[PDB]
Amino acid sequence: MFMINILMLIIPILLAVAFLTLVERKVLGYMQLRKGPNVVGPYGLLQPIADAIKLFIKEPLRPATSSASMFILAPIMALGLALTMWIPLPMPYPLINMNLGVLFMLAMSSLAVYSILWSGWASNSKYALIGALRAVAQTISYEVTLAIILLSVLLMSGSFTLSTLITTQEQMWLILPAWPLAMMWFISTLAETNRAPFDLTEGESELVSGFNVEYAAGPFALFFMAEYANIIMMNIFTAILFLGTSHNPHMPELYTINFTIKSLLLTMSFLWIRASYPRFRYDQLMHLLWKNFLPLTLALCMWHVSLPILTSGIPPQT
Amino acid sequence: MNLMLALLTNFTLATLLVIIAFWLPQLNVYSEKTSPYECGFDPMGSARLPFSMKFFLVAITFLLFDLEIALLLPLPWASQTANLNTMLTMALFLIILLAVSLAYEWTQKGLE
Amino acid sequence: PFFDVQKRLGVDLDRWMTIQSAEQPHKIPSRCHAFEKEWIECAHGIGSIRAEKECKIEFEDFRECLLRQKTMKRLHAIRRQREKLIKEGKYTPPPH
Amino acid sequence: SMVYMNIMMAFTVSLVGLLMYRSHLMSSLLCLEGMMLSLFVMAALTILNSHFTLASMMPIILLVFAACEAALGLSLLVMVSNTYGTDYVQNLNLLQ
Amino acid sequence: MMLYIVFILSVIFVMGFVGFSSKPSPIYGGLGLIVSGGVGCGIVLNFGGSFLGLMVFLIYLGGMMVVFGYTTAMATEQYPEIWLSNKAVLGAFVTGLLMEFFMVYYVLKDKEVEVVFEFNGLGDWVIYDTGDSGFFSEEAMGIAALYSYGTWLVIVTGWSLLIGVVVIMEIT
Amino acid sequence: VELPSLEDLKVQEVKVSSSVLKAAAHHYGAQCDKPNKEFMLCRWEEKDPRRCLEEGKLVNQCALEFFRQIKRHCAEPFTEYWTCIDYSGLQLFRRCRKQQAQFDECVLDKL
Amino acid sequence: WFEVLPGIAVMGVCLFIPGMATARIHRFSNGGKEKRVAHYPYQWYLMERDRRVSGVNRSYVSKGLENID
Amino acid sequence: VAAFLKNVWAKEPVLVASFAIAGLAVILPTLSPYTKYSLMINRATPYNYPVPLRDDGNMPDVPSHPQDPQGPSLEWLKRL
Amino acid sequence: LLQAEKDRRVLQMLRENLEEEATVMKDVPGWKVGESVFHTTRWVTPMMGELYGLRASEEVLSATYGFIWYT
Amino acid sequence: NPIIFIIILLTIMLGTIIVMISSHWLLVWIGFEMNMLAIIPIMMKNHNPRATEASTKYFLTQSTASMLLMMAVIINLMFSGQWTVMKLFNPMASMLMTMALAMKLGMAPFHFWVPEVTQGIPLSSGLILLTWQKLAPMSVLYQIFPSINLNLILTLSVLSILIGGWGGLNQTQLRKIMAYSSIAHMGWMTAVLPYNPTMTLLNLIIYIIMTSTMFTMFMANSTTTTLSLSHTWNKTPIMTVLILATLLSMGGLPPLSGFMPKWMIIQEMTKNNSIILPTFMAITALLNLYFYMRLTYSTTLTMFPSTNNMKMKWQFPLMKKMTFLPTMVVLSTMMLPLTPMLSV
Ligand SMILES: CCCCCCCCCCCCCCCCCC(=O)OC[C@H](COP(=O)(O)OCCN)OC(=O)CCCCCCCCCCCCCCCCC
């Protein structure tokens, strides 16, 4: 029945990414002093069944000027590498056990931006043309900030797999010891996935609407359901790579219970920001990475290398 | 043998869902006029995409810092050895060979 | 012209990765490992110009350890001793 | 066995009319930067199916230049089509 | 999911190439690679070498190609028609595709034909393993990390890259 | 080539799972060492594990009476000991640490 | 302030399924014992052995001490 | 020169935190005696299988029974 | 102990893949019973094609590819 | 800028020192893989629309030239699986070595290149550095030396010293005339190579000097043949007796040293009782001389001094070590039966 363990995953998650869109504007509602979608629910909890159905009724135009062969294979992705990445992710028991799999995320973190470059180019001119070009450029310069500061800690835990990374955070919430890094693990995923303070990719201010501009109701649910299938995953990751829970070979169930009451707090962070801060004006946006974020990330790497060796600490792995 | 069962499962929901959205009302009987009114709010736009350089280097500039952090990758497996000094003395070279390669270019980024 | 400095003074530039049997850090072998220490033992004090017409035996099987070139043919030729006669008797084996 | 004749027919990707030509140089330079993987994979098996255990890094060093260098020679292809806007191998000017 | 799941990848790989080994309007050139690179990193993930496979995604297919694709907006081709554009690409294709096919047809369509294509048997993966073994990180490229014995191999590559930028800080 | 017949085969293999086989496994070898180290030297010292089959039946033998020993005195603490370690994944040794004494109560003591 | 307390309870539970599904399929498919894991070729080597000796074909049925008497 | 070192720390206090950690990780591995413990532990982990040597005459040490007095003390770690 | 179980499993395995070969056919243009593809004489660990014949059904597929792609 | 130009210009020879010093096929890849990486910026310096349509016709012609080699390294990693550096153990290796390595040297074919680069590199300064790349490859061929199909390395030779000869008789630009007849002297040294491979180097050093001392002379302003006419009545006549004391010696006549390689080489190529080969080489370098005559009828015949051209100033170039070489490029014949027993 291994095929019914899968399809029990893909389906029950599409409800979260659906019902996030509701808690989008309730939480961001009371920052403003008001209430959130209310009239339709009664509580509102019934809103997203009505919204999923307005789009696919609503007619899906294509530009007369487009290349239809690319205008499909691209979105036929924004929903794969979002739903594949979930596969080897322990909670506690991952569906797959990949030996070195931690590295496998970067494989699928790196291969999504090659679905932006298609779509914005697939269609047409300068609002999605050079406007989907220069959100490529920022999306690849926030990896080098990443793979390093992912690679740092992994000196402090011994291997590339995720079954060890529950063992080492036992009674030490891995955020003490590298708290300088942890910050930069946060501003990255918020800068890379195109969210609030570095917002530019999806346009509001700097342009009209980035990269979404052409898709009518028909395809544009996918992206608007793809872009929220990354955001609740990196944030359902960070908390396996920092704030660890305590496995329990007996009541596995109490592992996940206490696990979603963390990863679900953590997420409610990209909403708790977006009410707050303004945007960066694309110069300042990269111009603050090389100069500023990076020099440290190298420097710390020269540090977490020696700290095990200089304490006879060297973590028990191959 | 069950990985590919967990991949082609995933696409086939996605490669399905394009047609049941894009295609299904696409053959609907509504008007859908062929008028060249599309390509919103930059009506005509006749040009080649000109070369704009400081767009370009931020490609190259990365690609090279990229390589060696593949070279740099097998530290945590190499922390288990016999003679370890040839590591710390050597490991710390790559980094400084990376960080140097900054400082030079750092005289000119331009507007990045 | 091949100077061979690493002979004169002390350093090792490469000389380690060179052949199929040297170290292998945890001491783990190759498959055809045992035929190296056999074949190098042959031509060393030789000047290699008579090697080709001298040793050649300890070399050939070594080339036939490596690729399994023949044993795969005498094998593929059991598929012609059986599996043309399947209907003509001796199913071979009895399962199990 | 068979996987050594594929990939090999793949490493005749050279095919040279399509190595320098015809225009859109970027197609030529492309089949070059993918002439690797015929060098890589082919050398990621022979190293692997027999346990060398040592040359195993070599596959890594076959990229680290193949990306480093082939990414250089991209640069010129800006200088050509900076002053033009079309690469078009059909620029001959320096003659003989 | 038979024993032939390797032979079915490569002959897709070998067909991965001939797409861009002719003349496809090189915004589809990429789509001749990331399939070929993908299936390529596919084949390698058998045989037991893994780490060394999963890198090609990270360092090349993921990282490199995007630069190859981040340009061809700077060299940007004209919007003449692209792909099926000019009536010429199609002529060169098939004769390649059949040339392995007609090869693959009677290479072995029978007992043997004849000699040079007859010394390759098929179907059990005769060589593809040996015996059993112990474990070190796996056995094979599990230990690919030598900052021990390898040094004069790194320090050239370590130094040869550092000059990569200086050359390119100029002509730029 | 010469291969021995089909005979001196079909011998008594210790048939147990891989969880119990690592249960004791520890008191096991440290105290025996009568054939086994010696049996290595009939392999490493001279290869071709064909010419040397003999101690193979000695080293296989030592196990037989070992598990046949333990069944007589105390199988009750053992049976319960290799249950926990058989409660599974990775077969850690740091979960059953408590019960490690109950198995080893009189084994190091009685016999 | 309260009206958002229901909004969570949809998303929250919908992530408490996929963690209890896989956990209780493995425990159910192998009958009470968590799934084995083979990282290193030695570790595998005992399962593919244990399949042979178990009762028929599977790795999850252990014989025990009385098996060999 | 200390007026300099305080007049770059009123302007760019960023990379200074990298240099401050750039060294101070290079220097220390040659100091604290905890190290070189690190090289002893890491040598003694038996990845491989020990093969017993042949004993004719000496046999310096290391009898047949392992727990008998044989060889060095690795149990300075167990107490550690 | 663990190994002294295997070496017997292959020598048992060759014999049946020989004794049940030599009784398939004895052909006049055939092969001698159990010759050597080499000249040299000692025990060299056999290739997968030696242990399992053209049998090639399933339990092979769970042997060579058994470890890779999954528990 | 000025520091690095000595960092780059140093790394070249470090690119070719790992070539001559190594045991290990990988390094002779990396070794002359980082020339095609470290040569390229030198071409540039004045950033013109030739060098950049030059070094790009150079680049991809030394890109594959390398990248085939790596295919003929990894063949005999299959067979014999022993790297190092020795005969190649398999014929598809060597035939894919030597006739894909002739690309860097370029031999009889594989030169539509040497005139397309050497011409119209805006930088004539040097362009003396294209005497390194003759010296990297040979330091393989001396090692692999006892494996060649032997019907080839002559067949690229004898189709070379011919084809590089006729190439120039039709030429005027004198960067080309050196470009041509530098395929020629690649005809003598790899025609010998299977017979007694020293008495090759002999021709290799005598070559590095003579072509060297040309350029250093061609550096004052000199470019086109008819700018070497305005030479003797303008710059200095002691220059003209020089350019006539070499260009003649370089095709060679016995009282000079240019006759030194042939005179020795044929001691070798007969005594192996091949006497029908060397005449045709010996006789073909003849019409390799008729460039130089008719080059040398430019400067001693006082041909129409340029125009009113008054250079009253003295010189400040770097003649460095030119005040030596044409006492060693000429007068050394009387000296040496050393060269066969000295480098050996
Ligand atoms: C648009 C519609 C048309 C497209 C439809 C099809 C799209 C397919 C796209 C493929 C994208 C995902 C491919 C990524 C491959 C990743 C494989 C991987 O990393 O698996 C990890 C694992 C490592 O093995 P390890 O854990 O170390 O050892 C276990 C020991 N028991 O590895 C293993 O366990 C063994 C590997 C088993 C899997 C076999 C190989 C699978 C990969 C083949 C991909 C083919 C490429 C397809 C195109 C890719 C384009 C992006």
- The closest alpha carbon to I37, from J80, C67, E123, C82, belongs to C67
d(Cα J156, Cα J187) in Å, to the nearest integer?
A: 8
CA E81 centroid distance within chain: 29
Interface test with C, best of J18, J20, J21, J23 (most C CBs within 10 A): J23
Helix or strand or coil: residue A84? helix
| DSSP-assigned beta bridge partners for residue J173 | J224
d(Cα E135, Cα G42) in Å, to the nearest integer?
A: 5
d(Cα J326, Cα E33) in Å, to the nearest integer?
A: 57
| DSSP-assigned beta bridge partners for residue E130 | I47
Residue with the smallest CA separation from ligand 1 atom 40 is: E42
d(Cα B21, Cα A56) in Å, to the nearest integer?
A: 6
* DSSP single-letter state for residue A290: I
Helix or strand or coil: residue E138? strand
Asked if residue J212 lies in contact with residue J131, where contact means CB atoms within 8 angstroms, the answer is yes
Using only the alpha carbons of chain D, give its radius of gyration.
17
Nearest residue on chain E to C32, judged by CA atoms?
A: E130
Asked if residue J329 lies in contact with residue J323, where contact means CB atoms within 8 angstroms, the answer is no
Omega of the bond leading into A214 within 30 degrees of 0 (cis): no
Tokens of C95: 């399962």
Q: Do E167 and J40 count as a contact with CB atoms less than 8 A apart?
A: yes
**CA dist J307 → I26, J205, J225, J235, J304 (Å):** 101, 40, 16, 13, 8
Residue A264, C-beta contacts closer than 8 angstroms, at least 6 positions apart: G8, G11, G12, G15
- For chain G, the domain total comes to 1
HSE-up of residue D40 (Cα within 13 Å, Cβ side): 26
* Element (DSSP H or E) covering residue C57: helix C57-66
d(Cα B107, Cα D22) in Å, to the nearest integer?
A: 40
List the 3-62 stretch of G: residues with Cβ below 8 A of I: 35-38, 41, 44, 47-48
| DSSP-assigned beta bridge partners for residue I47 | E130
Helix or strand or coil: residue E136? strand
Helix or strand or coil: residue H7? helix
How many angstroms away from the CA of G15 is the closest CA of chain F?
Answer: 24
The distance in angstroms from the start CA to the end CA of chain E is 51
Calculate the dihedral angle through the C-alpha atoms of J231, J234, J239, J243, rounding to the nearest 10 degrees: 10
Residue I56, C-beta contacts closer than 8 angstroms, at least 6 positions apart: E3, E123, E124
Q: What is the number of the ligand 1 atom nearest to the C-alpha of G44? A: 31
Asked if residue J200 lies in contact with residue J153, where contact means CB atoms within 8 angstroms, the answer is no
d(Cα D40, Cα D58) in Å, to the nearest integer?
A: 9
Write down the domain spans for chain B. Answer: 7-107
Helix or strand or coil: residue E130? strand
Asked if residue J158 lies in contact with residue J186, where contact means CB atoms within 8 angstroms, the answer is no
**What are the chain H neighbours of C26 within 8 Å (beta carbons)?**
47-48
Q: Do D56 and E141 count as a contact with CB atoms less than 8 A apart?
A: yes
Domains of chain E: 4-169 (1.20.120.1200)
Position B38, amino acid: E
Residue with the smallest CA separation from ligand 1 atom 3 is: B11
Q: Is E36 exposed, middle or buried (0-12, 13-18, 19+ CB in 10 A)?
A: buried
**CA dist A112 → A106, A197, E28, E34, E62 (Å):** 10, 21, 18, 13, 9
Note the CATH number of domain D2-84.
Answer: 1.10.287.3510
| DSSP-assigned beta bridge partners for residue E138 | E136
Task: Look at the block and give the residue holding tokens 């979260």.
Answer: A16
How many CB atoms lie under 10 A from the CB of residue J13?
15
Q: Is A136 on the interface with E (CB under 8 A)?
A: yes
d(Cα B85, Cα B75) in Å, to the nearest integer?
A: 13
d(Cα I15, Cα F1) in Å, to the nearest integer?
A: 11
Position D89, amino acid: V
Q: Which CATH architecture has domain B7-107?
A: Up-down Bundle (1.20)
Q: Is B49 on the interface with A (CB under 8 A)?
A: yes
d(Cα J115, Cα J94) in Å, to the nearest integer?
A: 27
What is the SS3 assignment for chain J?
CCCHHHHHHHHHHHHHHHHHCCCCHHHHHHHHHHHHHHCHHHHHCCCCCCHHHHHHHHHHHHHHHHHHHHHHHCHHHHCCCCCCCCCCCCHHHHHHHHHHHCCCCCCCCCCCCHHHHHCCCCCCCCCCHHHCCCCCCHHHHHHHCCCCCCCCCCHHHHCHHHHCHHHHCCCCEHHHHHHCCCCCHHHHHHHHCCCCCCCCHHHHHHHHHHHHHHHHHHCCCCCEHHHCCCCCCCCCHHHHHHHCCCHHHHHCCCCCCCCHHHHHHHHHHCCCCCCCCHHHHHHHCCCCCCCCCCCHHHHCCCCCCCCCCCCCCCCCCCCCCCCCHHHCCCCCCCCCCCHHHHCC
Tokens of A130: 């050079």
Residue with the smallest CA separation from ligand 1 atom 45 is: E39
Residue with the smallest CA separation from ligand 1 atom 36 is: E45
Method in brief: cryo-EM
Omega of the bond leading into J99 within 30 degrees of 0 (cis): no
Q: Do F49 and I42 count as a contact with CB atoms less than 8 A apart?
A: no
Could you give the angle at the alpha carbon of J146 between the alpha carbons of J141 and J149, nearest 5°? 90
Interface test with C, best of E146, E152, E154, E156 (most C CBs within 10 A): E152
* DSSP single-letter state for residue E74: S
Asked if residue A280 lies in contact with residue A198, where contact means CB atoms within 8 angstroms, the answer is yes
Q: Is E54 exposed, middle or buried (0-12, 13-18, 19+ CB in 10 A)?
A: buried
Tokens of G56: 């028929």
Nearest beta carbon to residue E162 from set B4, B63, B100: B100
Helix or strand or coil: residue I47? strand
* DSSP single-letter state for residue H30: G
- The closest alpha carbon to A22, from A51, A53, A65, belongs to A51
Helix or strand or coil: residue D85? coil
- The closest alpha carbon to J294, from J234, J240, J203, J225, belongs to J225
- For ligand 1, the distance from its centroid to the CA atom of residue E42, given in whole angstroms, is 6
Asked if residue A59 lies in contact with residue B32, where contact means CB atoms within 8 angstroms, the answer is yes
Q: Do J116 and D94 count as a contact with CB atoms less than 8 A apart?
A: yes
Q: Is A53 in the pocket of ligand 1 (CB under 6 A)?
A: no
HSE-up of residue E96 (Cα within 13 Å, Cβ side): 20
Write down the domain spans for chain D. Answer: 2-84
Provide the domain limits for residue G3.
1-69
Q: Do H38 and A299 count as a contact with CB atoms less than 8 A apart?
A: no
How many CB atoms lie under 10 A from the CB of residue E88?
10
